[PDB]
Amino acid sequence: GPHMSLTEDNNNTTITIAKGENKEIILHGNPTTGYSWVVDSSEGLSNTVEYVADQHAPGISGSGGKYHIKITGTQTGEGKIVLVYRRPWAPNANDRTFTLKVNVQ
Numbered sequence: 001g002p003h004m005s006l007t008e009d010n011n012n013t014t015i016t017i018a019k020g021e022n023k024e025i026i027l028h029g030n031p032t033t034g035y036s037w038v039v040d041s042s043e044g045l046s047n048t049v050e051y052v053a054d055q056h057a058p059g060i061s062g063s064g065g066k067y068h069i070k071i072t073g074t075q076t077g078e079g080k081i082v083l084v085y086r087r088p089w090a091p092n093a094n095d096r097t098f099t100l101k102v103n104v105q
Contacts (some may be wrong), residue, residue: 003070006100008009014101017073025069025083025100028054035087035095043079045102046072073104 006015006025017023027037029051041049051058053065069083078101085096 006069008098010100012099012101014078014103016103016105018105019073019076020025021073021087021104023071023102025071025098026066027069027085027098028064028066029085031063033078033087033092034090035085035092037069037083037085037098039081039083041080041082041099043076043077043081043102045079045081045104046070046074047081071100073102076104078103 001020003022003024006023007027029036030076038049048070050068050070051065052068053063056065056076060064071081081100081102083100084097
């Protein structure tokens with residue numbers, strides 16, 4: 001069925017879903033850092049990172065844009081998802097941490 005938009009208010013919260021149900025985390029990035037929202041850990045749960053330039057010019061330096069995280073309930077149980085704002089080629093202690101606990105039925 002249709003997915004549900006997730007945001008910062010869902011950070012470190014628990015959401016109960018049905019097995020196979022999809023969710024989407026929509027968070028804006030920052031070209032100042034060049035970092036991106038990428039899931040580094042999940043409890044057997046599927047994750048996909050898709051950049052979406054929300055009213056921005058993609059490929060154009062100076063523009064912004066958002067990163068959509070597609071989450072699928074692959075197995076029954078509560079899974080902790082670690083979503084980190086960082087760059088593969090630029091680490092940082094001040095990387096943003098976004099926690100999502102998905103209770104799959």
